[PDB]
Amino acid sequence: GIVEQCCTSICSLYQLENYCN
Amino acid sequence: GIVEQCCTSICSLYQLENYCN
Amino acid sequence: GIVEQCCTSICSLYQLENYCN
Amino acid sequence: GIVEQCCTSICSLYQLENYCN
Amino acid sequence: GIVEQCCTSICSLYQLENYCN
Amino acid sequence: GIVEQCCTSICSLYQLENYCN
Amino acid sequence: HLCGSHLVEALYLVCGERGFFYTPKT
Amino acid sequence: FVNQHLCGSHLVEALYLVCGERGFFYTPKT
Amino acid sequence: HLCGSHLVEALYLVCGERGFFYTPKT
Amino acid sequence: FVNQHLCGSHLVEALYLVCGERGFFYTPKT
Amino acid sequence: HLCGSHLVEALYLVCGERGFFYTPKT
Amino acid sequence: FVNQHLCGSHLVEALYLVCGERGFFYTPKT
Ligand SMILES: [Cl-]
Ligand SMILES: [Co+2]
Ligand SMILES: [Co+2]
Ligand SMILES: [Gd]
Ligand SMILES: [Gd]
Ligand SMILES: [Gd]
């Protein structure tokens, strides 16, 4: 998931936006 | 909510567990 | 400056990009 | 010690409580 | 104490060294 | 540079002071 | 008082792998 | 915006900044 | 509102490898 | 509460949250 | 001004391996 | 002062504390 992807690889702020309420 | 319980007022770390999944 | 735009007032992350190199 | 244990392995908040004044 | 010197008032990083072990 | 030196090796606060305005 | 990023840092600390929700409008 | 390498609490800080008053869910795998 | 170390944390987040300048007297 | 993996300043942040107004001692090995 | 977790972050920075004490009631 | 091992946002926090109102430039290699 996003927690794992940002730490093992990289992630964008736009992907993080998917987890806003 | 959490802002009223923990930021406006004060809460314990135990109260903070109310917001875990 | 940045303190007036973002701390005194509010700014977006897009506005924050104004201060990148 | 606790500094080393929390970083090389894991530690609990209850163990950390031992270092409060 | 440290809260009065550094939070209520202002302190330098040198003053902050007063609280090292 | 200083970003890389502090992370791969070590750096001092005095070296960091060189990047103040 | 725990506010802003400090509140979410504390949720992370207490909840960890359980995960959590931060819903300030709630 | 640039891509991000974010572990631990650093991810939660990033989510806080991105979402603001909207809030967010932090949902790691277990 | 983004102030102090929280403002520079956010600059780091948005700018990353591009780098940035924090000039509060500006 | 869950167990913790805490290095560097992250440990000091955790101690601050756990102890609050009681304060704490940070004592690494040297 | 250095308060709260920001004050203890700064103590960590200046003291490092020497360790330090945070005693706000002092 | 002691020497420092600082990666990521931790370096930016340190620069903020060292420089204060003077501000600073964060300039990584690319
Ligand atoms: Cl912080
Ligand atoms: Co970190
Ligand atoms: Co703060
Ligand atoms: Gd933090
Ligand atoms: Gd931080
Ligand atoms: Gd921090």
Side-chain angles (χ1 to χ4, degrees), chain A, chain B residues 1-14 16-21, chain C residues 1-14 16-21, chain D, chain E residues 1-14 16-21, chain F, chain G residues 1-16 18-24 26, chain H residues 1-20 22-28, chain I residues 1-16 18-24 26, chain J residues 1-20 22-28, chain K residues 1-16 18-24 26, chain L residues 1-20 22-28:
Chain A
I2 192 59
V3 173
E4 297 69 33
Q5 180 200 334
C6 295
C7 186
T8 72
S9 175
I10 61 168
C11 64
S12 67
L13 300 185
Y14 293 95
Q15 293 168 326
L16 292 187
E17 214 190 357
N18 291 324
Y19 296 80
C20 308
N21 289 135
Chain B
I2 181 172
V3 175
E4 291 66 48
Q5 303 303 306
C6 290
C7 174
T8 310
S9 191
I10 62 186
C11 69
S12 60
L13 297 187
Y14 286 110
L16 269 174
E17 297 193 278
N18 291 330
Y19 306 99
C20 302
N21 297 327
Chain C
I2 181 172
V3 175
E4 291 66 48
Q5 303 303 306
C6 290
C7 174
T8 310
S9 191
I10 62 186
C11 69
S12 60
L13 297 187
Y14 286 110
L16 269 174
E17 297 193 278
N18 291 330
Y19 306 99
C20 302
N21 297 327
Chain D
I2 192 59
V3 173
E4 297 69 33
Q5 180 200 334
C6 295
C7 186
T8 72
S9 175
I10 61 168
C11 64
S12 67
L13 300 185
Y14 293 95
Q15 293 168 326
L16 292 187
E17 214 190 357
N18 291 324
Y19 296 80
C20 308
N21 289 135
Chain E
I2 181 172
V3 175
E4 291 66 48
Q5 303 303 306
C6 290
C7 174
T8 310
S9 191
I10 62 186
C11 69
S12 60
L13 297 187
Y14 286 110
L16 269 174
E17 297 193 278
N18 291 330
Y19 306 99
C20 302
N21 297 327
Chain F
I2 192 59
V3 173
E4 297 69 33
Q5 180 200 334
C6 295
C7 186
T8 72
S9 175
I10 61 168
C11 64
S12 67
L13 300 185
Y14 293 95
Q15 293 168 326
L16 292 187
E17 214 190 357
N18 291 324
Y19 296 80
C20 308
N21 289 135
Chain G
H1 299 275
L2 289 169
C3 302
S5 59
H6 303 292
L7 182 51
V8 299
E9 286 272 348
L11 287 165
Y12 173 80
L13 191 77
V14 300
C15 299
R18 313 177 52 191
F20 64 83
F21 54 97
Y22 176 57
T23 50
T26 292
Chain H
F1 303 118
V2 302
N3 291 316
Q4 308 296 334
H5 185 204
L6 305 164
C7 299
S9 60
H10 299 298
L11 182 52
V12 171
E13 291 274 5
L15 279 169
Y16 175 78
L17 289 165
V18 167
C19 301
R22 299 143 75 192
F24 59 93
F25 271 72
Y26 175 69
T27 304
Chain I
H1 299 275
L2 289 169
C3 302
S5 59
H6 303 292
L7 182 51
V8 299
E9 286 272 348
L11 287 165
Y12 173 80
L13 191 77
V14 300
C15 299
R18 313 177 52 191
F20 64 83
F21 54 97
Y22 176 57
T23 50
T26 292
Chain J
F1 303 118
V2 302
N3 291 316
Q4 308 296 334
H5 185 204
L6 305 164
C7 299
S9 60
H10 299 298
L11 182 52
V12 171
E13 291 274 5
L15 279 169
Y16 175 78
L17 289 165
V18 167
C19 301
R22 299 143 75 192
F24 59 93
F25 271 72
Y26 175 69
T27 304
Chain K
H1 299 275
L2 289 169
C3 302
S5 59
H6 303 292
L7 182 51
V8 299
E9 286 272 348
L11 287 165
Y12 173 80
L13 191 77
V14 300
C15 299
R18 313 177 52 191
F20 64 83
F21 54 97
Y22 176 57
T23 50
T26 292
Chain L
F1 303 118
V2 302
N3 291 316
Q4 308 296 334
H5 185 204
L6 305 164
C7 299
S9 60
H10 299 298
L11 182 52
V12 171
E13 291 274 5
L15 279 169
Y16 175 78
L17 289 165
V18 167
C19 301
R22 299 143 75 192
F24 59 93
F25 271 72
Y26 175 69
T27 304

